[PDB]
C-alpha cells in the first residue's frame, strides 16, 4: 500500500534523492521514530521544490503523523503550500489537520505524561490567516491576527519559529496595505528572532530585502540602518546584483553627499516604478538626516 | 537487596518515543520501573530508591529516597520527552543526591537506564569514572540505546570504573529490537548483580 | 483462531498499564483526605 | 507569569535572616547559599515578608552542578501556609557575591514552583556595598 | 475438548471483563478526587 507509493517516488527522483526515500521505508519499519522524523526532515527542506513532495507528505501526514513529533507534522505541510500555487488545496489540508491533532492528545497526553500540542494550533491559524490576505479577504485575516496575539501573550514564552511566523504573516498585511513604517518596524522583530529553520535561504533574503528597504529610503522618521547591516539579512550578502544599487543609494545615504545621490536616483528613476513615482519622499529623507 | 540505595535516573530523550518496545519505549519503562522498585523492597525494606533524570540541560530530583512506589510513580506519570541525555552533568549530580540516606550503611549504586549514544566527549567520562570510584560509587548501565546507531563505548567506561567498592559496575546489553523492555531486565541481574562486599 | 490469540498478548500488556494507573489514583484520595 | 512587580520593598528581619542562614550551613568564602523568599505578590509592590535556607551542596569543579532537594521547598511551604497563609512561594535569594549565569538555570527550577515570575534577590551577606547591599 | 483453543477462550473472557471493570474504576476514581476538592 504505502510501498507503492515509495516505488513511484523514487522513480522520478534522482539518483541523488534515492537514499533519502529508501530511509522512509526502513526506518518506519524499525520503529525508529527519531529515525523517521530525521530523514523526512532532510527532504522537507530542499527537495520542496520538486514536486515530490506531494505524493509523499500527504499520505505520510494522514497516516503516520502519531509517531513523529507534532511540529514535525506542521512544518512538512508549509512546505508542501509553499510552492503550491493553489488556494482551494491550502485551505483544505490545513482544516484537516487541525481535526486530528484534537484526537491525538486524548491519549498522548498521558502516555509521554508531558507533551505539548499547543505548538501546532498557532501555526495552524497562522497559515490560515495568510491564506486569506492573498486571496484579498483582508478582514479575515485582521481578527485572526488579533486573537493569536491575546493568546499568546497568556503563555509566557513561545518557539522562535511560534513567534517567526506570527511575525512573518502580520508582516506580509502591512506591504500589502502599503503602511511602510509598520512592514518595516514588523520585519526587525522578525529577523532578530528568526526560526532556526534554514527555509530562509539567499534568495528569500534577497526578496525581504528590496521591500526593507524601499519601505524605509521614502520614510522620514526611519534610521535603524545600523541594526539592518547586522542582521542576517544583508551581513551574508550584499554582492548580488539587487544589492548594487540598492545599497548604494543606502551609502549614500548614511555619508550623507546629495551629489552622488542624485547621480544615482536619476537612473534607478526609469528602472524601477516605485521610485518614479515617489521623488519628493527621497529628497526629503535626505535633508532631514544630514 | 539488603542495604543499598540506588537511585534510578530515567533518561527520556527524543529516542524514547521510538516504538521499539511495544507499544512505545516510554510507556515500557514505566513498567521497568515498576518492576525494579517492587522487587527490590519485598526482599528487603531497607532498600530505597529516589527517582532523578538525566534529561534536560539540568538535572531534576523528582523524588528522594523512597519505600513508597506511590511518590515514584507520581513524579513519573508526568514527564517530558523532548528532554535530552547530558551524562557529564548527570553523573556528578548523583553523588549529590546520594549524600543524604535513610541510614549510611546503605550503598551507593546508580541503575541508569541508557535510550541514547553519548552526547558527550569521550575522553572526559573517563576521568569522572575514576572520581566516582573513590567514594565507591558503582553504575550499572542497562545499555540499549548507544547500539541503536552508534558503537559501543561504554565498555572503556565501564573498566575504567571498577575497582574494589561497595558494589562493582556492571554492563548489561539488552538487545534494542522488540522483546519488552521489563522483560530483558527481569531475565538480567538486577538483584543477581553483586559487589566485593 | 490465530487472530485471537495475538490479541490476547495486546491485551495482557493493557491488564497492566490499567493497575498501575489506579494505584497512583487511589494514593491521590489517600493524600487529600489527611489535609481536610 | 505576572507582570506586577513595579516595587520592591523589604523588611530588615530579611536582610537579618540572610546573614543567619549563611553560617548556619557553614558556607564561606565562595560557598553559596539559596532559599526561598517568601511573601506577598500578584500586586505592584512585592513585599518580601520572609525567607528560610534550603538544602543547597555547591561544586566548584562544575560550576553547572548544585544539589537542590526539591521535595523539601514544597514541604515547607506546606508547613507555612497553615501559619499564614498570605505567604506563598515568591523565588529565591542568593548571597552572592554576585549574580551568575548559572543563576539563570537556577531560576528555571523556581519558575515551576512560583505563579509570579520569581524574585531573585541578591543580598550580599557581607555587605561591601557602599549604598543598599541588596539589590532586586 | 482436545482442542487446546477451546480452553484458550476461557481466560481471554476473563481478560475482556476485567478490562470493562478497570475503566469504569478508573472514571470513579477521578471522580472522587474532585469531590474531595470541592470539600477541600
Request: aromatic share 0%; no cysteine; glycine share 0%.
Given at each position: 500500500e504505502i510501498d507503492t507509493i515509495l516505488s513511484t517516488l523514487r522513480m522520478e527522483a534522482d539518483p541523488s534523492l534515492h537514499p533519502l526515500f529508501e530511509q522512509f521505508e526502513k526506518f518506519y519499519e524499525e520503529k525508529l521514530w527519531f529515525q523517521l522524523s530525521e530523514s523526512l526532515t532532510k527532504f522537507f527542506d530542499d527537495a520542496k521544490s520538486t514536486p515530490l513532495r506531494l505524493r509523499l507528505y500527504d499520505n505520510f501526514v494522514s497516516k503516520f503523523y502519531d509517531k513523529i513529533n507534532q511540529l514535525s507534522v506542521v512544518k512538512y505541510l508549509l512546505a508542501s503550500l509553499k510552492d503550491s500555487k493553489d488556494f482551494d488545496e491550502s485551505l483544505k489540508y490545513l482544516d484537516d489537520l487541525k481535526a486530528q491533532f484534537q484526537e491525538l492528545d486524548s491519549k498522548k497526553q498521558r502516555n509521554n505524561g508531558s507533551k505539548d500540542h499547543g505548538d501546532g494550533i498557532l501555526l495552524i491559524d497562522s497559515e490560515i490567516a495568510r491564506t486569506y490576505l492573498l486571496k484579498n479577504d483582508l478582514v479575515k485575516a485582521r481578527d485572526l491576527l488579533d486573537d493569536l496575539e491575546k493568546t499568546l501573550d497568556k503563555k509566557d514564552s513561545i518557539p522562535l519559529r511560534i513567534t517567526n511566523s506570527f511575525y512573518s504573516t502580520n508582516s506580509q498585511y502591512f506591504k500589502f496595505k502599503n503602511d511602510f513604517n509598520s512592514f518595516y518596524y514588523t520585519s526587525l522583530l522578525y529577523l532578530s528572532t528568526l526560526?532556526?529553520?534554514?527555509?530562509?535561504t539567499l534568495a528569500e533574503r534577497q526578496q525581504l530585502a528590496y521591500d526593507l528597504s524601499i519601505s524605509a529610503l521614502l520614510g522620514d522618521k526611519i534610521y535603524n540602518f545600523g541594526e539592518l547591516l547586522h542582521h542576517p539579512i544583508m551581513e551574508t550578502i550584499v554582492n548580488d546584483s539587487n544589492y548594487d544599487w540598492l545599497f548604494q543609494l543606502l551609502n549614500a545615504l548614511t555619508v550623507g553627499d546629495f551629489d552622488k545621490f542624485d547621480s544615482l536616483i536619476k537612473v534607478q528613476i526609469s528602472k524601477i516604478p516605485i521610485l518614479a513615482q515617489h521623488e519628493s519622499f527621497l529628497r526629503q529623507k535626505i535633508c532631514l538626516m544630514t | 537487596m539488603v542495604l543499598e540505595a540506588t537511585v534510578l535516573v530515567i533518561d527520556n530523550s527524543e529516542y524514547s518515543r521510538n516504538g521499539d518496545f511495544p507499544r512505545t519505549r516510554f510507556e515500557a519503562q514505566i513498567d521497568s520501573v515498576e518492576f525494579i522498585f517492587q522487587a527490590k523492597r519485598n526482599s528487603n525494606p531497607e532498600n530505597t530508591v529516589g527517582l532523578i533524570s538525566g534529561a534536560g540541560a539540568n538535572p531534576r530530583v523528582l523524588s528522594t529516597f523512597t519505600a513508597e512506589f506511590g511518590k515514584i510513580l507520581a513524579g513519573l506519570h508526568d514527564t517530558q520527552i523532548e528532554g535530552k541525555l547530558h551524562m557529564a552533568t548527570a553523573l556528578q549530580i548523583a553523588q549529590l543526591t546520594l549524600?543524604?540516606?535513610?541510614?549510611?550503611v546503605q550503598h551507593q549504586r546508580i541503575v541508569a537506564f541508557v535510550c541514547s549514544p553519548i552526547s558527550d566527549s569521550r575522553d572526559e567520562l573517563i576521568r569522572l569514572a575514576k572520581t566516582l570510584k573513590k567514594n565507591n560509587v558503582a553504575v550499572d548501565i542497562i545499555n540499549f540505546g548507544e547500539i541503536e546507531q552508534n558503537t559501543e563505548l561504554l565498555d572503556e567506561f565501564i573498566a575504567a570504573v571498577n575497582n574494589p567498592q561497595e558494589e562493582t559496575s556492571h554492563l548489561l546489553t539488552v538487545t534494542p529490537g522488540p522483546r519488552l523492555l521489563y522483560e530483558n531486565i527481569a531475565s538480567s541481574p538486577i538483584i543477581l548483580e553483586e559487589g566485593s562486599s | 483462531t490465530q487472530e485471537l490469540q495475538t490479541r490476547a498478548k495486546l491485551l495482557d500488556n493493557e491488564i497492566r498499564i490499567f493497575r498501575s494507573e489506579l494505584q497512583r489514583l487511589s494514593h491521590e484520595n489517600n493524600v487529600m483526605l489527611e489535609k481536610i | 507569569m505576572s507582570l506586577q512587580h513595579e516595587k520592591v520593598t523589604i523588611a530588615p528581619l530579611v536582610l537579618l535572616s540572610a546573614l543567619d542562614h549563611y553560617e548556619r550551613t557553614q558556607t564561606k568564602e565562595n560557598k553559596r547559599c539559596v532559599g526561598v523568599i517568601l511573601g506577598d505578590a500578584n500586586s505592584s509592590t512585592i513585599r518580601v515578608t520572609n525567607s528560610f535556607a534550603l538544602p543547597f551542596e555547591e561544586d566548584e569543579k562544575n560550576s553547572d552542578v548544585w544539589f537542590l532537594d526539591h521535595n523539601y521547598i514544597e514541604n515547607m511551604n506546606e508547613m507555612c501556609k497553615k501559619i499564614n497563609a498570605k505567604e506563598k512561594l515568591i523565588g529565591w535569594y542568593h548571597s552572592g557575591p554576585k549574580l551568575r549565569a548559572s543563576d539563570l538555570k537556577i531560576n528555571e527550577l523556581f519558575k515551576k514552583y512560583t505563579q509570579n515570575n520569581p524574585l531573585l534577590l541578591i543580598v550580599d551577606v557581607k555587605q561591601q556595598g557602599v549604598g543598599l547591599p541588596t539589590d532586586a | 475438548e482436545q482442542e487446546a483453543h477451546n480452553k484458550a477462550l476461557n481466560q481471554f473472557k476473563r481478560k475482556l471483563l476485567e478490562h470493562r471493570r478497570y475503566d469504569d474504576q478508573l472514571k470513579q476514581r477521578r471522580q472522587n478526587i474532585r469531590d474531595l476538592e470541592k470539600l477541600y
Open positions: 526560526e532556526p529553520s534554514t527555509s530562509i | 549524600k543524604h540516606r535513610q541510614n549510611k | - | - | -
